[PDB]
Amino acid sequence: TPPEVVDFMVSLAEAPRGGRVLEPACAHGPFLRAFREAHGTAYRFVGVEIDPKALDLPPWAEGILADFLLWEPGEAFDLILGNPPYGIVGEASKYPIHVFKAVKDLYKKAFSTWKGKYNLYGAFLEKAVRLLKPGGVLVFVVPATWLVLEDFALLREFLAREGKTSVYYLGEVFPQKKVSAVVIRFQKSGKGLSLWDTQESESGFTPILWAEYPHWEGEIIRFETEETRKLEISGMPLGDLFHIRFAARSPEFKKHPAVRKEPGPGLVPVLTGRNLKPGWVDYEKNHSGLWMPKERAKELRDFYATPHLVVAHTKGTRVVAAWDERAYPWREEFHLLPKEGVRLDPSSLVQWLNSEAMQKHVRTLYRDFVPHLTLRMLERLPVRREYGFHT
DNA sequence: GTTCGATGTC
DNA sequence: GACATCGAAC
Ligand SMILES: [K+]
């Protein structure tokens, strides 16, 4: 972990004299060292590490060789700090964390917050909270993705009901790692959420209070402003105007008997996010390596037969939209079908969605937490009567 | 059915 | 920086 990030986290940390201080996934124990330097020696220092090659603590700390996620210590902790591992547990061809099926089963048994594919860092957070004494403190640096994503809804709700939470946005602070990070300071007492921005100087990071949600129950966390609130009440949410569906996935296309790996007569490309631009679709260029008869597309998704609005999923945090006039097969993106009794003006709605006001709105709210516009961000986009109207 | 990325690759 | 994963996962 970069030293300025450690120093900032250590500035947020507290323990009583003689308190038990833990660094999970400790390796050589950079957090233990920095905490001792800053606060003195009258604490019980413990580090937990799975790799024998990595555990290298000073003799004033106790080292334990264990999978932190399945470790059952005798006593609870006053302070838990550090940098959990980040990564989805799954097959090596697609995912970075590789464990026996039987171990993954033990994680799922252990963690009430485990949802969908989940992530080591979520499980590390839940484990840490469970190991805290009442009034205990944890301070972790983790990806920002938990503030917004469905996979982390149980985690947000768990935190909300277990104690009080402060979130400090750092962004892309790991050199040569593609992750936007936050610090979480959790205390196992009280309630509420405090959101903080930071400014980095030579001197280190400085927290700036952004907003407080004293009655937080685990809702998505956003950077809201007076302007984002004004826009949101200006119109109907997009999700009330449209059914929002996703493209059929690559394997469905690949095994479909009408799909081909080479162009040919009557054959059309299966479109991806690279075919979608602000306000238009490139129908000619193939980016998927897949081709099919256009008329057979409805066999994968019924809505492929009907011209409709498409919104991008993987262009970062922004709103890129086009009207698919032709009704082609897509491998990617959101597909929005108007609900019963909805009147639309496709041309002007697309213009509004691609507008600078809209790009600013989403960048404000969701910064760079994830490299997507997700469904939960998309369903909340405001649409005023000129563009779309539910009668 | 659709979700997610210590992203993957240019 | 540009420009987006794409298929295991549930
Ligand atoms: K790691």
Side-chain angles (χ1 to χ4, degrees), chain A residues 1-362 364-391:
Chain A
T1 311
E4 38 281 318
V5 173
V6 176
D7 287 350
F8 179 65
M9 294 169 64
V10 168
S11 84
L12 300 174
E14 280 158 49
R17 174 152 288 241
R20 304 160 53 78
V21 175
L22 172 69
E23 184 185 342
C26 61
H28 65 102
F31 289 88
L32 297 177
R33 290 169 194 271
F35 186 89
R36 192 173 197 257
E37 281 293 342
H39 294 143
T41 73
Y43 305 96
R44 183 120 189 179
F45 296 98
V46 186
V48 174
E49 171 58 62
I50 206 173
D51 183 0
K53 296 185 285 182
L55 180 64
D56 193 20
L57 299 177
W60 50 253
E62 199 206 340
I64 293 150
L65 286 165
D67 180 343
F68 175 73
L69 297 180
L70 301 170
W71 176 58
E72 288 301 334
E75 191 181 340
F77 288 86
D78 294 278
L79 175 62
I80 303 174
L81 32 35
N83 192 335
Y86 314 154
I88 294 156
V89 180
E91 170 181 325
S93 77
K94 195 59 173 174
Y95 300 109
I97 310 298
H98 316 128
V99 308
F100 285 138
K101 165 140 197 311
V103 175
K104 195 188 190 193
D105 293 343
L106 289 171
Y107 291 171
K108 289 178 181 176
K109 183 170 172 168
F111 302 113
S112 65
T113 69
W114 199 281
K115 188 188 179 188
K117 305 187 295 304
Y118 214 47
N119 201 298
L120 254 30
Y121 89 77
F124 264 69
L125 279 159
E126 183 187 337
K127 186 63 172 169
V129 178
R130 297 188 175 284
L131 293 179
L132 249 16
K133 290 164 181 180
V137 171
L138 78 82
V139 190
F140 273 5
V141 56
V142 292
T145 76
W146 73 273
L147 316 206
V148 287
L149 296 186
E150 273 307 328
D151 259 20
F152 300 100
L154 293 174
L155 176 68
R156 286 196 305 270
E157 293 162 19
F158 172 85
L159 299 170
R161 84 171 73 86
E162 297 290 330
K164 71 180 65 89
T165 300
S166 285
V167 177
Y168 305 82
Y169 169 87
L170 306 180
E172 270 187 274
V173 297
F174 294 99
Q176 296 88 248
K177 266 92 171 69
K178 198 160 271 161
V179 62
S180 173
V182 291
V183 170
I184 169 163
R185 191 204 187 269
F186 172 88
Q187 180 168 35
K188 204 169 169 157
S189 72
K191 71 172 203 179
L193 170 72
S194 293
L195 183 64
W196 303 73
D197 196 359
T198 60
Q199 249 176 188
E200 197 194 2
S201 297
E202 175 148 324
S203 183
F205 292 91
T206 297
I208 303 139
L209 176 62
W210 191 276
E212 300 184 271
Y213 298 93
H215 300 312
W216 187 59
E217 292 176 352
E219 296 91 347
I220 283 159
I221 306 167
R222 309 185 299 170
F223 284 90
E224 300 184 277
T225 66
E226 175 182 283
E227 301 305 321
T228 65
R229 292 277 186 87
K230 189 186 306 184
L231 228 219
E232 282 183 328
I233 66 171
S234 79
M236 284 185 65
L238 206 44
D240 290 353
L241 297 182
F242 297 90
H243 302 281
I244 309 168
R245 305 280 127 89
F246 212 78
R249 309 317 301 125
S250 66
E252 299 182 61
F253 279 106
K254 280 181 175 164
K255 78 190 214 281
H256 194 92
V259 171
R260 298 296 186 268
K261 304 278 295 174
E262 220 54 48
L267 305 188
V268 121
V270 179
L271 309 173
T272 66
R274 306 192 151 76
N275 290 103
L276 180 57
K277 285 87 172 59
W280 65 283
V281 183
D282 193 334
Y283 294 101
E284 300 285 295
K285 256 78 165 319
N286 186 291
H287 299 279
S288 60
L290 308 176
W291 280 265
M292 65 179 308
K294 204 192 87 68
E295 65 177 6
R296 291 262 244 157
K298 61 175 147 66
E299 291 170 34
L300 285 103
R301 292 299 183 276
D302 64 355
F303 64 72
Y304 291 146
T306 303
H308 69 276
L309 172 63
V310 181
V311 179
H313 178 49
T314 320
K315 284 167 191 288
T317 296
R318 40 223 229 184
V319 184
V320 177
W323 182 259
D324 184 353
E325 41 168 30
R326 292 189 200 182
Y328 266 43
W330 295 78
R331 206 203 67 194
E332 299 309 329
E333 312 302 44
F334 298 106
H335 299 274
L336 287 72
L337 309 309
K339 300 185 169 173
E340 176 77 0
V342 168
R343 250 297 196 200
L344 68 170
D345 176 342
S347 191
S348 65
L349 180 61
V350 170
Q351 253 193 74
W352 163 244
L353 295 168
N354 293 320
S355 77
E356 303 197 337
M358 187 59 88
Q359 315 305 317
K360 202 176 298 298
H361 179 73
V362 300
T364 295
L365 291 173
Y366 311 108
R367 303 189 169 188
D368 62 355
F369 300 165
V370 299
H372 299 104
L373 189 74
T374 64
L375 174 56
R376 295 294 184 191
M377 304 169 184
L378 176 64
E379 67 184 16
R380 298 202 64 182
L381 304 181
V383 182
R384 75 164 151 112
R385 288 182 206 85
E386 277 270 75
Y387 315 125
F389 190 40
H390 206 314
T391 61

